[PDB]
Structures are given as C-alpha cells and as structure tokens.
Point group: C3
Chain length 535, copies 3
C-alpha cells in the first residue's frame, strides 16, 4: 500500500505526484478511475515552463493510462484506460488538476450507428460488437446466449446502449476486468473463491472489516413473473413460463426470501411475436433485475485488494438474519494520505439499466427483390434506408384491407416499391407494412383532380393495361381488361367492345328485347339448330 506509479501514454510519470485515487469497478457498467494530482514544488510563475507543459502533453485527453500500485513484494495493477476528463483547477496560488480515466468499454458508448444482425446467436452478436470496437471478449457458459435470431436490429442507439439492453434480455452479468471483459451467468457465480468475513476476527490472517452496511429492499418484488408473447401460427398467447424464485446467493443474503407484498404475482403480455424460448429467457431476465435490488450491502475493507468482481464473500459469526453468501459487485478503491488504502467492496446492484436499445416512429422502405428462405408466412422483404446497408434486407408482414380466412384481397407489391412501415410494439425486429405510396419515380397514373372524375384499379407492366375504371362524372364503369377489350356500362346504356372474338358457352340462352332487336354480322351469318324455326 505504498508508492503507486502512473504510466501515461506508455511513459511512467514522476513530475506530478497523485494526491487522490478513486477507482470504481462495477458489474454491468463501465469501470472508472479518478486521479487528483498536483505539482510538488513548481510555483505558478514557474508552472508554464517547458518541462511542466511537456508532461501535460502526455496527460492530454485521449492518451492511455495505467496506474500500478507496487506492493513491495507484488505489483498490483488497478486500472488501464483512456483519459477522458482533464480538468485543471487553480486557486489560492496552487493548482490541482483532476483526471477522469475511463475503461475501454467507454469506447462503445461514444458511437451511435444502426446495424442489422440478421441470423446470429447473441454470442456471435456480442463477439462482433466487441471486436468492432477493439476490446477482447472472454466468455462464460451461458444458457441464454446460445439463441439464434431470425432478425436482430440495433436501431440508432449506441453500442453500449445496445449491449446491456441485450444483457438485460438474457439475464447475464458483465464482469469488466482489467485486461478482458468477461460474461457470466449469475447462477454460475456460486461455488467460486470465498473470502470469509467474521464478526470475531482477532487474527492476522483474517480480514479486517470497517463500516459494514447492508440493506433489505422490498419496494417492488414480483413473487411470480411470466412474459407471454404472441404466436402467429395457431393464434394464441403462449407464455414461455411463470419463472419465479431465481436461485441466487445463500441463506439470509439471498434475494429469495423477503416475501412480496402482493402474493398474486406479475404478468406482461407482449404483442410482438416472441418465441417460447426468448420469452422464457426474458422472464428470468426481468426477474433478475427486480430481485437483485432487494439485498444490497457494502463493506469497507483494508488495502491489499485481491478481490475481483466475480468471487463471493460469506458472512460468518454474525446474527442469523445477517449471515450469508453473495456475489461481490462494485469493488472500489481509495488512496489518500488520511487513509492508507481501502477497498469498500459491495454486494448486489440496482435495477434500472442506463442504456436504451426501440423506434416508435413511422418510416418508409423500398421493397427488395424476391426471397423465399422464410417459414410459411406472407412476410415480404424490405430495404430500410435508416439501416445503413442497402444490400441486406428485412422481412416485414404486410397489412392489407380484408385479409380473411382464405379469401384475401392479395395485391402484393412489386420489388422496388415504397411502403409505410410501422413496428409491432415498437420493436425493430418486427416491422409491419401499412400501405404503399406513389412517387415522382413511380408515378401515379392520375393526378388528384377537383371533382375527381375517375377512380381506377389499374394493374399493368407498361405493355398492357388491365384496368377497372369507374368514371363518376360520366357515370361509366369501363372494364378495360387489356387495352383492346372494354366492357362499357353507362348509367343510361351498356356496351361490350371487343377486338377479335366473342364467345358464349352456356346450356340454355335467352334474349328479351321489348322495343326492337337487330343482329348484324358481315361476310357470314350462320344459325345452327336441331329444330330451327322463325315466328
């Protein structure tokens, strides 16, 4: 607990001693540090010389930093990360510049870009999310991250804002170490290395404890939680499971216990088509957030600092309400001259996740070319301009007027058409199409006109127009089925106009005209019957 050294941009510093260090690690967050450091001898008149301004070039913002506290027989490292705030404060004719050093996980909270992960497990997602930034990814045995997605969209949020929105949907911690961040399931954290905290103590081998504190919340505790999502086939709400009572911690320090104030439970019924596997992992994901705020604590220990964010400490010798074993969260350090070196290690975590993943707003999208590899649904492929890649596509269910049992109005839009997409429960994985639009490129066949004469349902490729025209002014219905054949019906008349050949195929036939009748055919008229007569 003596003589730390600060390596700034690969070069160890000796011009400015540190008068304060506060290193704060934490589960499911970036870890941070804080260096308050000052000059030992240089006055304010002799501060602005060439030697002191040289070292502040090493301390400039964005340079790496690693502070290593030398034990005397070991060399503890405490932090390794980038300078983010360098704030110099000068008063009472002396200066004291603060540093704020942030981990490499703070490199992800900088960016903001939308990206499409189409068919990947979350382990394949979090690999490509951390490899993209430049921090290595150590993994653990997770039962939730081996889960394949048909689509997975990060929609205009940060990379660390997408990260813990996914780590809260699977229920797995983040353990940011010094060299590599590692993921671990909270249940697998048990049976790890175990430092004992005794109320007796009175030994040199035991751990000295000061300022112990623990707190039992029951403000909001679900006793039973289920997350149920829609099933598109066999239209029902299939709940993934009523997952209550997660096994975590040990006796009288478990979040289990602390019985809920309502015995009925909890229920959320998502309307997005979630699978039974995903909503099952989501139910114990949300359950883990509410229960783990129930038991909290902190313990201000001595210096030596071999504690990390994975291990669990047990309380022994205490009262039967206070004893138990729980996983360490949020290791802190402090280095003053008032105190030598301490470690106020803690237990448990808060519930609310600072990230944001959902896009509530409407968008437009161009329908891409044909694809078939989906399951049997009417999902049509779209291209979203908000998504950056114009080559990758998204499935999207089509909303149409009168889509009945087998009797649907089916006019599937052509590739290259513009649509109006909205998202099921604001989820970027589940878009749905609300219509189609015309353009200056894809022109409507008619401008809107005052007392709009014609109302059409015209479908064509440009070589042949198969129309259904209703003229409300001239009181017509023109089935212009092809450009040649018009079946005209006035309000006062009727017609049937052909180009080549007309055909009647019935069993019997009747004609009845009271005023007159005239049949006329040039160049041949034949009338054939087994009994022909004229009356």
């Amino acid at each position: 607990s003596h003589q730390l050294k600060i390596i700034a941009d690969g070069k160890a510093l000796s011009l400015l001693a540190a008068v304060d260090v506060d290193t704060c690690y934490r589960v499911n967050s970036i870890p941070s540090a804080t260096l308050k450091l000052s000059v030992p001898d240089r006055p304010l008149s002799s501060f602005s010389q060439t030697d002191v301004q040289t070292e502040l070039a090493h301390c400039q913002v964005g340079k790496t930093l690693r502070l290593e506290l030398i034990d005397g027989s070991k060399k503890w490292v405490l932090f390794n990360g980038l300078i983010t705030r360098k704030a110099l404060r000068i008063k009472n004719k002396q200066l004291l510049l603060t540093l704020v050093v942030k981990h490499r996980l703070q490199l992800m909270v900088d960016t903001q870009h939308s990206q499409l992960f189409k068919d990947k497990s979350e382990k394949a997602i979090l690999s490509t999310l951390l490899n993209q930034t430049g921090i290595n990814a150590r993994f653990g045995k997770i039962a939730a991250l081996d889960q394949k997605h048909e689509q997975m969209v990060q929609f205009r949020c940060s990379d660390w804002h997408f990260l813990l929105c996914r780590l809260s949907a699977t229920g797995a911690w983040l353990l940011p170490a010094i060299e590599d961040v590692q993921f671990v399931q909270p249940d697998a954290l048990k049976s790890n290395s175990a430092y004992t905290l005794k109320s007796r103590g009175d030994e040199n081998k035991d751990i000295v404890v000061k300022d112990a504190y623990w707190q039992f919340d029951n403000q909001i505790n679900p006793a039973l939680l289920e997350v149920s999502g829609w099933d598109i086939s066999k239209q029902q709400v299939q709940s993934g499971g009523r997952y209550g009572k997660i096994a975590l911690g040990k006796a009288a320090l478990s979040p289990d216990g602390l019985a809920s104030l309502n015995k009925t439970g909890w229920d959320i019924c998502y309307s997005s088509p979630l699978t039974t596997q995903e909503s099952g992992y989501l139910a114990q994901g949300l359950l883990l957030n509410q229960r783990i705020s129930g038991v909290t604590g902190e313990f201000l220990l001595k210096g030596d600092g071999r504690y990390q964010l994975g291990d669990n400490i047990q309380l022994t010798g205490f009262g039967s309400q206070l004893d138990g074993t729980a996983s360490i969260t949020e290791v802190r350090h402090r280095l003053n001259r008032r105190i030598d070196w301490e470690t106020t290690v803690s237990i448990g975590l808060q519930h609310e996740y600072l990230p944001i993943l959902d896009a509530p707003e409407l968008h437009i999208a161009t329908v891409a070319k044909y694809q078939q590899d989906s399951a049997v649904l009417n999902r049509i492929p779209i291209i979203l301009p908000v998504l950056n890649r114009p080559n990758e596509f998204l499935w999207a269910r089509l909303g149409k007027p009168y889509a009945s049992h087998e009797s649907g109005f089916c006019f599937y839009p052509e590739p290259g058409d513009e649509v109006i997409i909205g998202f099921f429960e604001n989820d970027p994985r589940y878009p749905v199409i609300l219509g189609a639009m015309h353009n200056p490129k894809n022109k409507a066949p008619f401008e809107p006109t005052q007392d709009n004469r014609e109302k059409v349902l015209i479908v064509k490729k440009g070589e042949a127009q198969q129309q259904l025209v209703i003229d409300g002014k001239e009181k017509m219905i023109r089935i212009n089925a092809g450009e040649n054949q018009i079946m005209l019906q006035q309000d006062k008349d009727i017609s049937l106009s052909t180009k080549k050949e007309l055909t009647l195929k019935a069993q019997t036939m009747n004609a009845t005209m009271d005023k007159s009748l005239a049949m006329s055919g040039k160049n041949s008229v034949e009338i054939k019957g087994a009994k022909i007569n004229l009356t």
Copy 2:
C-alpha cells in the same frame, strides 16, 4: 410527547428504543415513516445472541407496524403500515438500523397488470381498484367521479400509476388517513375545522409557531384553460368549456390572484373523441395542478398533533399580503431528543404527477363475434391479447381505403380475423384498425411469387368462391363469380363462360361483326319477332 411504543407484527417492541421518527403524510401520495432505532445495552459481541435475533424476526421486511405515541392522557396513533426497507448500519462499534415503513397504498404501486373497465363510473372504478388490493375506500361528494365510461383501459401500468392518473383527470384530492383513505373535492374542503395562526399569540391556548415559510410562484400559470376534443358525429371540435379561475383558498392565500404573465390563456385541442362532459372535468383538472403550485408554504408547529390532511388553517394578524386560509397538505412529524416533538405542517402541493397511465406502440387483435349494443357507428369489436381477459371485448373504429360520404369501400372483416390496431392520441380507450393480416391459420390464397402472376380480390366461405382475378402475365381478367361462371377477357380475345343459363334484358340490341358471325345452339333454336326478315 413522551414514550412512543412500536407494535411490530402485532407485538409491541421493547428491546430496541427508537432514536428517530420521521412520519410524512401528503395529499395525492403514499404516506411514509422512518424509524431509526438502536440497541440500548447489547455490545457487538453480544448482539448476535438468540434474544436480539428474535426481535429482528419481528422487524423483518413485510411485517406490519403501527407506532402509537402515548400522550399521557390520550393515545395518538401516528402510522400503520408495512416494513419496506430494513437497513442495518454498523460503525464505530455500534449499530443503528433504519426502518422505512410504508402505507397500504404502497401495496398498489407493487403490481403491474393491464385491465379493462368497460362500463363503470370512476367511483365504481376506484372502488374495485382499492378493494382488489385490500385497503378500504371512504368517499366524498365528488361532481366528477359520477361519470360513466364506454371504455376505460389501464394498459400495462401499476395500480397506483393508474390511480392518480385518474385523480388528475377528475381534479380530486387523495387524503390518506391512518385507517381509511378518503377522496374529497378541493372545493368542498373549505368551511372545515379551522386552527388559527396568530402573529400575536402570547397565550397558552393559542398555537405556538416556529419557522414559518410561504412562497408565491408564477412560473407557469394559465389565466384561462380549455380542453377541446373531437366530435365524431357533426365533425367539429366541441370544447367542453373555457374553465378558468378555480375557487380555492381564501384572500391573499388563494391560487387565484398571482396574475399570469400572458393574458391570452391556454388551449389544448385533443384529437381523441372525448365527450363534452369529460373534457370539461379535464379542463379544471389540469387547471388545478398548475394553480395549486402557485401558493405554497410550511409552518413548524409544536407537538400535540391533532392536525390532519383535510382541515384548513387561517393566518390572522399578519400582513395583508400574508393572511388567508388554505387547506393543509403534507403533515409531517419529527421525534428526536434535540427537539421534543414537532409538526411541520404545510400548504399547497407540487404539480407533476409521478404516475403514468398511454400505449404509443402498435398491436394486433383478433376480431370477436358480433355485438350490436353500441351507438350508430362502424366500431367493430376486437379482442386484445395484451389485455388479459379473452372474454371481454373492445370496440375499435375501422380504417379503410376510400370511405367517402355514402360511397364507401366496405369490406368488414370476419370474426376471428387478425388486425393492426393503433390508438388515437395513444389512448387505450380509442383504438383504430389500420388493416388486416393473413396467417398460417388464416392462409392467404396465394404465396407471394416472383413476377407475381395474379392479383385477386377473392371473397368466399370455402364452398363457393366469388373472385375478381387479374392475371398480369397471361393478360387476363377473370370474373370468377362463383366457381362456374367465368367472364374472361384476354388482351387479344374475350369470352363469357356460363354453366346453366344466360340472359339479355334490354330495350334494343345491336350486334356488329365485320369479319364473320356464327350463332349455334344445339337441340333448339327459336327466333321470335313481330317483323322477322333475313337480308
């Protein structure tokens, strides 16, 4: 003001004396308490024995608690509620465990479930909202709560999050007492019991006052407020009323006065179809929130504590700016040894409501069976899976392409069909349908195909298909009206194919074929006219 006793889980406590009590009641909130209590004699080595850990089992989280301060000639009760935070803190070789006791109104903020109140007054709503949890409901004479709703949806928010979102839409206070919560209109609170606060004092019968404070805000004050909602019939915006100047308090402590910085007023024009009665009660509901933050105050009194949250105290003898009468809000108590017992009673309240009621996102819904009991509209009944009950139904207006004056494209969806619902101004009482969908259960008649050959408008029950087929590849329009009768029109040809019998009923008739004509009917041909000739 001596010797309070704490009954924890029905058993009065004497092992741990209380070193602090802070009981905070408040209008339109849960009331709370805070007990800091410690052991009188037991050291840390003798803390973990069987006698002390027995009493902490009574102090465990979720147990009821009631603290009763014994006056000596009376027995005041101060609080009755559940333990919610039990936090033990140990430092300097002594421990001091804090309790946080919460009212039975905190039982409602725990839950989160969506529920459908179809046809009930709000008095019938708040009865079934408080009976469901387990707190009795005392009522007062309210002019706003006797208001019937066609629908009323709590959509995935808490019960206390739905409660004051309704108490802010009707403009009525909540008065949480010790034994039963009671509702009261703010205007009916006047002419209640009246404790006088004098600047002269100098008596034993008068009330001793310390640390008086009052504050006059005018940051945002509407001078005139109107809330106007849409009227579906006779399409206009019918405002419920320009309700300004609510009568509350008395002279120079009324929120009236403190003239607005803008004289023009305030206007919100909701697009949801609110009634004229509801938007009238909403206008003085929102007006009550802005004005009541205008005049605020607090008065730190002596011990005896006969003040409750309903009565109003008048100031007399003060300056003519400072005098007046206003309803007591937010009674507090404190019990130290530095002070004996005090009551820092207050006046007025803040404006923002911590609850949340609105669902902005899209959903899907299955259309239920036929119902008729609505007023004359095209509202079709739907079943929402996000709502828990599959038996109860919701009306929903139908969005269709080209719904004109009397000339509408009317294809009302069958019962059992899936729709795309969105909500008018995000209101769960007003859904609207944006389309209909196909399914693996309700299959589309055709898969989407590359260069999609056919475009259909087919309507059927499965025994008979009445179609309107346009084949864009083979350049046809096939009016397959029934499975037998096809009216074919090629791009180069035409046809009219029948099964049984064709009919012509005109006045005159013409046929004109320039290349050839042939009529053929087997087994009989008859031609009848008053003048028959062949040319």
Copy 3:
C-alpha cells in the same frame, strides 16, 4: 461597486435593503436574477403595519423590476424583468424574503399552443415568434436562418420550447441582453472585442483574476458527422454532407483538438424527406452541440462588469496547453458584503437542450378543398383539428394499398373526408395518411352485420350509384354500374340486365349452347349477312 438601487414596478425601492444579489445570464437560455432582501429596522410586531405592506404591493408577483448598480461615475444596469417567485421566510424573529426575477424570455415558456408556419424563412418565423410575446428581436448575419420551409409546425409545445429546438437545428446561439435579445452565428463571434487574461498581471490596468478553472471533456465527440435524409424523387438517401471540424475558438481552447476515441465517425439516416440544404445545416447544428461541451471553463473576476455574452477573452502567458481564445458564455454576478462585487465569467456550454419541439401519436384530419400549388406529388391537403386554424391546410402524402410503378389503386378521397394521419419519423411537417373513415355524418352504406351478406366497392354522388357488389350469402356478383344496368352472375346462373341498349363490337362471334337456344326480340328482328343460311 456600491449602492445598487432596485426599481420595482417603475418605483425605486428604499424600504428594504438587499442582502444578496445573484444575476445569472447564459447563452441559449433565459437569464435570471435572485434578490434576497430584508427590512433594516422594523420588528415583527411592527412588520404588518401600513407602510411595510405598501411596499410589498410593489414587490408583488408579476410586477416588473430593474436593478441598477451605480458605479459612482457610471450607472450600470444589471437586470430588467418580471418578479416570478416572491418567497418570504421568517425565523429567529427576523424575516428575509427572496425574489426570483426572470427575463422577458420567460414570457414565452409560459404559453403552450400549436401553430402552423406554412411558407416562411426561420428569420420570418423567429420574428413572429418574438413579436407575438412582446420582446424585440435583434438579428445577426446567419447563413442558416435564410431557409424557406414548405411547412413548419409547432405542435403542442411552448414557444420557448419551439425556439431552441429551432436554434439547435440551425446551429446559432442566443444572446439575451438587457434590452434586446440578439442571435449570432458562433463562427461570427470571433474577432470581437478581446479582454486579455494574463498570468503575470501585476498592473492596475490589467484584469484581476481569481479561482480560474477549465475542463476538457472527450466523453462523446464525433470526429465526422453526417445527417442523411430521404429523397422522394429518385428514391435514395442523399446526405447533405459529412460536416466535421467546425472552426470555433482558438489554439488550445478550441473544441477542435481533443481527438475522438473512435476514428470512424458518426452517422444518422433520417427517414423523413429532408432537403439537402436542411440536413446540411442540421449536421453542423448537432456537431456544434457535442463539440462545445468539450472545452469548458470559468474565471472569477472583480467587479466592474463590462463583460457581455458576445465577446471573447484570450488567455496569455499561461502554459501552452492552457492558452487560447474562446467566446464568453454565462456571465454571472454576485453582490454580498463578504465579497464586494464579482463576475465569475465562463466559457463554453453544455449540450442538452431543455426544450421539446414531435408528436408520435395518431390523429384524424378532415380533407380540405382542392389546391394545386405543390410540386408534382400526390400530396393531398388536410385540415388538422389539433392545429388551431381551420382555414389553413397541410399537405399529406396518401397511403394506399398497391401503389405500384404506374399501376396504382387510385381512390383519392373527396374533400370533407376523415382520414387517419401518422407522421414520418414523428415529424409534424411530414404527415402521411393511413386510411379513411366513415361517420354518422358520412355514413357507411351498410351497417356491419353478422354473417355480413354483401361486400361492396360502391362509388356515387347520390344521384347515380356505380357499384361493385359481391353477395357472399346469395352467391352473386352484381356490377350495378349505374342504377339501371346490372351484370348479374349467380353461382348457378348468369344474367346481363340492361335498361336501353346493348352492343357487341367484335370481329368474329361464336355462341355454343348444348341444351337449347332461344333468341327473342319484340316488334323487330333483323339478321343481316353476306351469306345467310339456316342449318
């Protein structure tokens, strides 16, 4: 720095001396003041007399106030604005009433009304936004405010909530002076008046500096930013430009420098149809907010207070990391007796704008009469009831099922029809129509019925109905094209019913009936051919 005088409601005050003044100006905010003032001699018993309550009538809320500190040879004015909080606090038998004085820019944050600016530049918008309240508008040379809008909607937000949501979309500061607020581009603020801050000092003409502070953030810095919006014609995403590296400040106090932690940059792809000029000004608008939080500082100077919010101060003689020139932001003043008079002037600003402009929710709108002055698009004019003016109209793109290349289902709604509008990326400038509705005024031609017999596509004016009826129960398709002419097709039969005249115009014609054939025409039958025969 002696003897300020406070003019309250046009009348200078002398009954109550001021024991504290804190005047806080700030760029892109309202400026404020705070007056703690107390009585010099009047006791509490003699506080409530007629002379002291007279002066508090001048100090009442909403009265104007102007405090003028008299230098002795000059007369500095410091503030001019309205009383907003008057809070009297009385304790220890003495009172000390606080005033909170707010600028005339606080008059705009009061209101909340929706308004439609159809065709105006932002300079013509901010003129009519400040003239409406009653504060004059001084302008500067802005390259962004001379930008014409096809539409511009303030949708149910405050006037100051619409103001800086527009000043952040153009990237121009607000400089609130004492007499007139002035706008200025941040780049044009350079080469202004320049007060030098020296580390040497040691003169009477130089500026005395205490408590200097500066802070370099790099928490979130875009290295390159582009904002790309949709182009309706030639459907693509045309980015306005990759505007990085804004020129502001000078060397070692510029936001340029402090290199980003990610070198890749930043990208947002809006789906709303923004122009190339608007998204270009939006890219340097958002870039200005992130970079200007990078360099911050504050300098506690002496009294005399000739500094204003526009000028820039340079640091000279300091270290080469610390020197530089940057524009003054957030001038403060303090007037105690402990300190004589100070001015803790600052540099740089925070990033997040407290205002709110976007309406995510659905609405309804009545389609207005015909208008033509748009560019070539299918935008149809609507009237929004949420917008206050029923005379002004909004364009809105129409969403229709199957709007293909030139083959669109075109049923443009009549004027006076009700629609379902949603907004592209929640933007009130870009609505889009999702359907049309029936009414009690615009009645559907049929009530929805159980086992709904008929499905119609009927278009009419009331004098003549041109229908397309499919009866699913009676298994018919009735092309009631006009009220007289019905083309009936049963499931077992067919018909063709006319009123006046039928016509066949083909080249060849065939009839084929296997059971029987009968043609009948009363009062005349003619059969004409070049070769007539009967077989």
